[PDB]
Amino acid sequence: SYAIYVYKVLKQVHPDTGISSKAMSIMNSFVNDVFERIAGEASRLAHYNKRSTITSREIQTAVRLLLPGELAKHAVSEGTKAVTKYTSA
Amino acid sequence: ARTKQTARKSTGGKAPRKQLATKAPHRYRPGTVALREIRRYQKSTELLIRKLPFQRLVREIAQDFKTDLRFQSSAVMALQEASEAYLVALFEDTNLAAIHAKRVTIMPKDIQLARRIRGER
Amino acid sequence: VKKPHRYRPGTVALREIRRYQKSTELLIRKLPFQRLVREIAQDFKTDLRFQSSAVMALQEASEAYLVALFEDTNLAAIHAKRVTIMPKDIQLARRIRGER
Amino acid sequence: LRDNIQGITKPAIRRLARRGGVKRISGLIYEETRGVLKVFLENVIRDAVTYTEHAKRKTVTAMDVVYALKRQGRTLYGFG
Amino acid sequence: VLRDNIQGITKPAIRRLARRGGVKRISGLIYEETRGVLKVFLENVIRDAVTYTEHAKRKTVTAMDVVYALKRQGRTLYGFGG
Amino acid sequence: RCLAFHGPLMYEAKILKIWDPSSKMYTSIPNDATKEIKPQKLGEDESIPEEIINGKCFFIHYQGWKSSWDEWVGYDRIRAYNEENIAMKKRLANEAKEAKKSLLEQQKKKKL
DNA sequence: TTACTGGCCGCCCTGGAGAATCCCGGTGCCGAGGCCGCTCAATTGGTCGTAGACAGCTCTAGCACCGCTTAAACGCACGTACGCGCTGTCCCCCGCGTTTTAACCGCCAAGGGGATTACTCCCTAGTCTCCAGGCACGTGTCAGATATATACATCCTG
DNA sequence: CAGGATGTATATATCTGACACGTGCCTGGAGACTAGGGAGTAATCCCCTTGGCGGTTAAAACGCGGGGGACAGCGCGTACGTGCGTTTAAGCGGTGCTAGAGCTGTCTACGACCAATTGAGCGGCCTCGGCACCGGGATTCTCCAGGGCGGCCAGTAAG
């Protein structure tokens, strides 16, 4: 149930727009699929390199394979912010 | 000489015999409405295949894989919204193949090609 | 007068179709290919070194992709009832696949 | 349920292809499309049943059909 | 630095493929067009191929890498490396 | 080089050898490193037409025709290669161009 | 008057003349495979901890049926747009010599980086304890569905 | 061009079933503390890519005819779409019934884990036969010049 999380985003990006109870289903079914593709690719990527543990660098490289073009640029630009912010505190 | 046969041996036809074998102005030119039918559909999302004739189509297929299945009324939908889309993609590809062949009307040649080229044969 | 005994246009190609499908060697010339791959990768990350096989592995796949293309653009060219394939088919046979 | 594929009508296919984008549909399609749709379900169901037959269940639930569709490459969204 | 290599794929090498494919007559525009396709196909495989190579921090693009970049896109390869 | 008047119009040819027929023994550049010319006795299997043989004689290779197909010529057929001698071929070639078209008028008359 | 066979034009399959390809008889060449240590991963014998197999039970959700409205299907009529088959036209690509070129092979090298160990360290899994964010359920305004009734919008069809 | 007819789009108003917020709750996550096992860090070395050298010949580029397919035009006739009228059965809303989905509790069989043991499958060496290669005939494949063959008028035989 990523739906509460999705609503929090939508109410941020659009303070007025609402979301139907089927879209949440699309997104809850969507985020899970992207997460599976990425984390699945991340696992296979560590196996090729004989590494045992999935780490911060594995996911980043796992992204640039899946997301096409401009998305790869901003996603990894977003990801690095989170880790640096988290590691700040 | 070769004589086929008669299938049934009675003059009455068993309709009169009990325990029967057989008784227990203004017009639009062609095409102008077609386009009007497209924009009336490509703008809408409602399901096109009739539902209760689909339900009875899925059940018939399930039998020869397993007997006495019971489908959740959701899992008959999830099939329909899939098999509707599969076809709409197939028809776009065939329309491309026909525009290619320089005619307008899709035909089974176009269907079979749009499947062969996909490799989904 | 003066006839060099030229085969009929069309029967050299079929002949050499029968000669290549039977054979199995590599068609795209090895070295002028390698100088292409080194040139493509030179764009994404400068100063790479390619293992020998890793160049071969590409050419082995790059061929069997094109051959998969022509054997599928031909079906499009047969379709319009003509024989000669044409770029208005490779533009089709790549959009039917959805790979675009 | 002897013949239900004849239940997917002529206007049913005609309506679909109208969404697809065609203009004129030749007569032999209305039969030939049924041949495609049938061989599509025989693949999607035969997978959906196997997931079901494994979990010991006796009901092909939507969470199965979404899975059977996923291996087909035709990922489905909105159900689970 | 390398330049103008795509025209290295010789015009016969386009037909020599196309024969094996099974086409009889080839128009004039196909040759210049096919390079356009093959170049697109490499910038896909090579890239995904490079990314792994960057990942393990190893400079040389391992033959095993290319088998992976292909395996991701959907064209598995048999016999090279494994 | 040489040019060989073949019937109506000539064609492009190349001097395969240079032979003094009075010597009755020909000198040819062999095939391949550069193969130096060798003076060889006229082949008995080799036949010479008189026009080539009265004056200095020479076997030729036509351009465009295969060596197995390639054959002999007379010397009246041979005028030394010259752009003017190429022109007359072309004039005949142009005269040969509508020659097929002039015949086709009878076929045009045959069809109509 | 009617009548219609014969003659000449009409025009094939078939031998040949090449080219391409197969047959087979040698002739080396190198890797398929057989053999030999050996080591390190599979095997065996035992314990421990729990995943799930199994049994029973609470309610959901599905199946069956059914009677009514009505929207969708179906069949018939018709008229005409288009798929298609034919003819004609011409350009452009295949075929085959020539002429230029750069792939290839083999050969040498150099140094670069991928592949070991040693070491040392520090990071996440595992565990225990406490609590508040996410979930489920309730509800309650409310934006969207729905009915109805203008305002142009295109479409023919003169 | 001129103009009616049509269909979709547009406005106003009327309900609702439905999504947004409230509130309680309990279960997963955050705090806190190690432990050793994975990960990084330093030589090193060697083998393996990159790089240059020269012969050489297989192959790419180039040139030209013409032969055949690309394409445009056209005649057409039929398999289409469109519209009407009839007629299905699809959808809606209920009533009823019940397999069976989902969840609990109990506890036994099963798999993780470990030490010691051993032989299977590993790398390395070495070899000789399967096979690539070449050569030249024998054989097949293809292309094409010369060649028997119905369709017509001319003069035929005549009611």
Count of beta carbons in the 10 Å neighbourhood of residue F101? 10
Q: What is the DSSP letter of F20?
A: E
Question: Which SS3 state, helix, strand or coil, does residue F60 take?
Answer: strand
Answer whether C83's CB lies under 8 Å from B120's CB. no
First and final C-alpha spacing in chain E:
32
Place of tokens 């009929």: C8
CATH pick for C1-100 out of 1.10.20.10, 3.40.50.2300, 3.40.50.720, 3.40.50.2000: 1.10.20.10
User: Which residue type, as a one-letter code, is found at position C70?
Assistant: F
Smallest CA-to-CA distance from A6 within C24, A14, E62 is with A14
Smallest CA-to-CA distance from E5 within C65, C33, C57, C66 is with C33
Q: How far from the centroid of its chain's Cα atoms is residue B49's Cα?
A: 9
DSSP codes of every residue in B20-89: -SS-----PPTTHHHHHHHHTTTT--S--S-HHHHHHHHHHHHHTTSSS-EE-HHHHHHHHHHHHHHHHH
Answer whether B49's CB lies under 8 Å from B80's CB. yes
CB contact, 8 Å: B37 with chain D?
yes
Determine the nucleotide nearest to C6 by Cα–C1' distance: G95
Tell me the C-alpha to C-alpha distance, in Å, between residue C99 and each of A62, B116, C44, C87, C89. 22, 15, 22, 16, 14
Nearest beta carbon to residue D65 from set B53, B68, B79: B79
Smallest CA-to-CA distance from E2 within C50, B90, F63, F108 is with C50
- Helical spans, DSSP H, in chain C: 13-20, 30-44, 52-79, 87-96
Question: Which SS3 state, helix, strand or coil, does residue D60 take?
Answer: strand
**Dihedral sign, CA of D24, D27, D28, D29?**
positive
Question: Strands C49-50, E60-61: parallel, antiparallel or unpaired by DSSP?
Answer: parallel
Q: What is the DSSP letter of E23?
A: -
Sequence ranges of the domains in chain B: 25-121
Answer whether C74's CB lies under 8 Å from E21's CB. yes
Place of tokens 């599509």: D40
Least Cα separation, residue D46 to chain A (angstroms): 23
For D59, phi and psi rounded to 5 degrees? -140, 125
For residues D31 and D37, give the distance between their C-alpha atoms in angstroms, rounded to a whole number: 10
Tokens of F5: 């008047």
Chains within contact range of chain C (3+ C-beta pairs < 8 Å): B, E, F
Q: How far from the centroid of its chain's Cα atoms is residue B71's Cα?
A: 22
Smallest CA-to-CA distance from C36 within B86, A64, E46, A24 is with E46
Q: What is the DSSP letter of D17?
A: H
Tokens of A17: 């727009």
For residues C33 and C27, give the distance between their C-alpha atoms in angstroms, rounded to a whole number: 10
Smallest CA-to-CA distance from E55 within A33, A38, C57, A56 is with A56
Answer whether B57's CB lies under 8 Å from D8's CB. yes
Least Cα separation, residue B1 to chain D (angstroms): 37
Largest CA distance in chain A: 49
Least Cα separation, residue B38 to chain D (angstroms): 5
Do the Cβ atoms of F64 and C4 come within 8 Å? Answer: yes
For residues D32 and D37, give the distance between their C-alpha atoms in angstroms, rounded to a whole number: 9
Question: Which SS3 state, helix, strand or coil, does residue E71 take?
Answer: helix
Cβ C32 to strand H below 7 Å: no
CB contact, 8 Å: E73 with chain C?
no
Question: Strands F9-15, F60-62: parallel, antiparallel or unpaired by DSSP?
Answer: antiparallel
Smallest CA-to-CA distance from E51 within A42, A36, A40 is with A42
E12 beta partners: none
CB-count burial class (<10 Å; 0-12, 13-18, 19+) for F62: buried
CB-count burial class (<10 Å; 0-12, 13-18, 19+) for C91: middle
Answer whether F12's CB lies under 8 Å from F64's CB. yes
User: Which chain A positions have a beta carbon within 8 Å of D67's beta carbon?
Assistant: none
Answer whether E51's CB lies under 8 Å from A61's CB. yes
Decide if domain B25-121 falls under CATH 1.10.20.10: yes
CB contact, 8 Å: D1 with chain B?
yes
Q: Please tell me the total number of residues recorded for chain E in this structure.
A: 82
Cβ C31 to strand H below 7 Å: no
Chains within contact range of chain F (3+ C-beta pairs < 8 Å): C
For residues B33 and B27, give the distance between their C-alpha atoms in angstroms, rounded to a whole number: 10
Place of tokens 């008995």: F44
Smallest CA-to-CA distance from A42 within A72, A63, A73, A69 is with A63
Tokens of E49: 């191929």
Counting one residue from B and one from C, how many pairs have CB atoms under 8 Å apart?
Answer: 34
Answer whether C68's CB lies under 8 Å from B89's CB. no
E16 beta partners: none
CB contact, 8 Å: B53 with chain D?
yes
Question: Which SS3 state, helix, strand or coil, does residue C30 take?
Answer: helix
Tokens of F29: 């550049």
Q: In total, how many domains does chain A have?
A: 1
The answer for residues whose C-beta is within 8 angstroms of residue C88's C-beta and 6 or more apart is: B100
Distance F34 CA to H133 C1' (A): 29
User: In what helix (H) or strand (E) does residue F15 lie, and over which residues does it extend?
Assistant: strand F9-15
3-state secondary structure F62-81: ECCCCCCCCCCCCCCCEEEC
CB contact, 8 Å: E24 with chain C?
yes
Tokens of F65: 């025709």
For residues C48 and C32, give the distance between their C-alpha atoms in angstroms, rounded to a whole number: 18
Q: What is the DSSP letter of D78?
A: S
- Residue A23 lies in domain: 1-89
**Chain C interface, mutation test: which of E1, E10, E15, E20, most C Cβ atoms within 10 Å?**
E20
Tell me the C-alpha to C-alpha distance, in Å, between residue C84 and each of C19, C94, D42, F86. 20, 18, 38, 37
Place of tokens 């199995």: C24
B-E interface (Cβ pairs under 8 Å ≥ 3): no
Q: In total, how many domains does chain D have?
A: 1
Place of tokens 């679909």: D16
User: In what helix (H) or strand (E) does residue C27 lie, and over which residues does it extend?
Assistant: none
User: Which residue type, as a one-letter code, is found at position E6?
Assistant: I
For residues D50 and D44, give the distance between their C-alpha atoms in angstroms, rounded to a whole number: 10
Cβ B104 to strand G below 7 Å: yes
Smallest CA-to-CA distance from D74 within B98, A33, B116 is with A33
Positions in chain H where some atom is under 7 Å from a protein CB: 5-9, 18-21, 38-39, 48-50, 59-61, 65-71, 79-83, 89-91, 99-102, 142-145
Distance F82 CA to G107 C1' (A): 50
CB-count burial class (<10 Å; 0-12, 13-18, 19+) for C68: middle
Strand H contact residues in chain B (32-71), C-beta within 7 Å: 32-34, 36-37, 39-40, 43, 50-53, 68, 70
Question: Strands F60-62, F78-80: parallel, antiparallel or unpaired by DSSP?
Answer: unpaired
The answer for residues whose C-beta is within 8 angstroms of residue B63's C-beta and 6 or more apart is: B69
Question: Strands F17-20, F78-80: parallel, antiparallel or unpaired by DSSP?
Answer: unpaired
Least Cα separation, residue C17 to chain B (angstroms): 21
Q: What is the DSSP letter of B11?
A: S
The answer for residues whose C-beta is within 8 angstroms of residue C40's C-beta and 6 or more apart is: E39, E42, E43, E46
CB-count burial class (<10 Å; 0-12, 13-18, 19+) for B50: middle
Place of tokens 């941020």: A12
Tokens of C27: 């068609």
User: Which residue type, as a one-letter code, is found at position A6?
Assistant: V
For residues A87 and B3, give the distance between their C-alpha atoms in angstroms, rounded to a whole number: 94
Angle at E13 (CA atoms; ends E12, E18), nearest 5 degrees: 90
Smallest CA-to-CA distance from B113 within B102, C68, B96 is with B96
Q: How far from the centroid of its chain's Cα atoms is residue E65's Cα?
A: 14
